[PDB]
């Protein structure tokens, strides 16, 4: 068989770290050396392991809150947010026991549409939204008037702007090519000869015919359409951000000692990055490629030959001979190949699907899609900062150490989550590291667990990088890459991989 399932391999455990003087725990972990693929056996999920300890030493985690402490959550909130009329705590502990409530916003307020999604951190490497990292329901008072159309919105405290900067860009390109070639040839020869004169008669005849018909037809269509729609601009404040309870707790529990597996679990739960600016929008993309070819072939040959004699004196003698020979060879070949890809982001399932249909939309459903995108937009452009920039002394003790731990772990994570580790798919399939195992995402018209099935006899193989080599020594710290993981040339190879085929840096 061509395929063999590769089972998941994870490392021998780390050394234990030292026991956390407060968290009273020590940690061990393994790296994933090789993901499972092609239904290879998955690893044990326990690439993390934990042991309890005695409290060998105190730790100064008891970060002083001058504000009110939200009794159940431990969120520190300013006393001006007591009796605010708003759950600025998690648990209304700010609003209990209040003699009088000073409702600041009498008005009806909506939240910004999709604003909660932007509060959740992204795995940048996978572009995947993860757990919540920022609390976009904290308002710290607020109650400034913000409007979009006739609706009024309560801006979260964390948000500097969410503003309906509205724009749309459309692109249509269509390239139709036809060529056809036709070649008919005919050749005909005839000969006759006679003699006649006791009597004698002689005759010779010959006929030859050759005929050739060759025809080829080639047709090509490329159509691409793209719509980029933009419906708001979002910016997060640069300073004094209010973290989500779950993220807050999960950061608190981070061991002061560097133990990669816990920071990896942090990234797996919440990602590596958070969004500081984004453009909210919708995307529609349509790409149709068609090639049609015909060939017709015909060769025809005919021969006749005659030789015929009579001799007379009555009495007569004679010989006469005739041949006919005929050949026809004919072939037809006809092929069509068609690919369509349609991509849609933002909008509503009805308009999403009716745009996903294989035909170009009516401008009504484009209008309906763009209207729906306002209320359920996607993120078109993002600008992000790494999640460690949230670990701040106003929230966490030892914050510089936790931050530096994250800084290292983020490098180790970027290395470990890289899909370079997977074996290449066949059929130009893209291996995606998806947990501890790797799934070949196959272009349609290629199929199976490795994209091993296709009915197309040839398909360009695009280049794939191998994993970059380890850091070279100082005097020009360096890494290298080889385009080895899928060498492009096969099957009328596609483009080579991008550079940098080697990369070099300060020590």
């Amino acid at each position: 068989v061509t395929l063999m399932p590769i089972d998941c391999e994870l490392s021998s455990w780390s050394s234990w770290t030292t026991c956390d003087p407060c968290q009273k725990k020590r940690y061990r972990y393994a790296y994933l050396l090789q993901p499972s693929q092609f239904h290879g056996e998955p690893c044990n999920f326990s690439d993390k392991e934990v042991e309890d300890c005695v409290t060998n030493r105190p730790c100064r985690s008891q970060v002083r809150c001058e504000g009110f402490v939200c009794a159940q959550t431990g969120r520190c909130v300013n006393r001006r947010l007591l009796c605010n009329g708003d759950n600025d705590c998690g648990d209304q502990s700010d609003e209990a026991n209040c003699r009088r409530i000073y409702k600041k916003c009498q008005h009806e307020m909506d939240q910004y549409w999709g604003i909660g999604s932007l509060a959740s951190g992204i795995n940048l490497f996978t572009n995947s939204f993860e757990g919540p990292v920022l609390d976009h329901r904290y308002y710290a008072g607020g109650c400034s008037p913000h409007y979009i159309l006739n609706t009024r919105f309560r801006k979260p405290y964390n948000v500097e702007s969410y503003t309906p900067q509205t724009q749309g860009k459309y692109e249509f390109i269509l390239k139709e090519y036809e060529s056809y070639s036709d070649f008919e040839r005919n050749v005909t020869e005839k000969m006759a000869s006679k003699s006649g004169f006791i009597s004698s008669q002689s005759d010779r005849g010959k006929h030859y015919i050759r005929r050739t018909k060759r025809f080829s037809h080639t047709k090509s269509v490329f159509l691409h359409a793209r719509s980029d729609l933009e419906v708001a601009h979002y910016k997060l404040k640069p300073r004094s951000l209010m973290l989500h309870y779950e993220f807050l707790q999960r950061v608190k529990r981070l061991p002061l000692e560097y133990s990669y597996g816990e920071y990896r679990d942090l990234f797996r739960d919440f990602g590596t990055h958070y969004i500081t600016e984004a453009v909210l929008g919708g995307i529609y993309e349509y790409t149709l490629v068609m090639n049609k070819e015909a060939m017709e072939r015909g060769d025809y040959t005919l021969n006749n030959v005659h030789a015929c004699a009579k001799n007379d004196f009555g009495v007569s003698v004679g010989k006469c001979r005739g041949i006919l020979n005929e050949i026809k060879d004919r072939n037809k070949r006809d092929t069509m190949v068609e690919d369509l890809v349609v991509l849609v982001r933002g909008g509503a399932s009805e308009h999403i699907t009716t745009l996903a249909y294989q035909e170009l939309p009516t401008a009504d459903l484009m209008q309906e899609w763009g209207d729906a995108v306002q209320y359920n937009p996607a993120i078109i452009k993002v600008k992000v900062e790494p999640l460690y920039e949230l670990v701040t002394a106003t929230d966490f003790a030892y914050s510089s150490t936790v931050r530096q731990n994250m800084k290292q772990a983020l490098e180790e994570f970027q290395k470990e989550v890289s899909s370079c580790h997977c074996a290449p798919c066949q059929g130009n399939g893209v291996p995606v590291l998806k947990g501890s195992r790797c799934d070949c995402i196959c272009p349609v018209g290629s199929q199976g667990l490795a994209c091993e099935v296709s009915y197309r006899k040839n398909t360009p193989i695009d280049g794939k990088w191998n994993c970059w080599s380890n850091w070279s020594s100082c005097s020009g710290r360096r890494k290298t890459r080889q385009r080895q993981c899928n060498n492009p040339p096969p099957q009328n190879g596609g483009s080579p991989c991008s550079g940098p085929a080697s990369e070099t840096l300060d020590c």
Binding site: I148, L149, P164, Q165, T166, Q167, A363
Partner: protein, 50 residues
């Protein structure tokens, strides 16, 4: 484009207009109301050229 499509757009831009013409003032002119405001203003002038 359809006359109705364009007219509906041109009406809707009444409620969601973008900025389409501007006259600009350097950002350093806004450095204000802060400690050392006058010094920071100069340094931000020098920053913008850089």
């Amino acid at each position: 484009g359809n006359k109705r499509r364009y007219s509906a757009w041109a009406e809707s831009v009444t409620n969601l207009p973008q900025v389409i013409k501007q006259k600009l003032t350097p950002l350093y002119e806004l450095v204000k109301e802060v400690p050392c405001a006058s010094v920071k203003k100069l340094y931000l002038k020098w920053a913008l050229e850089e």
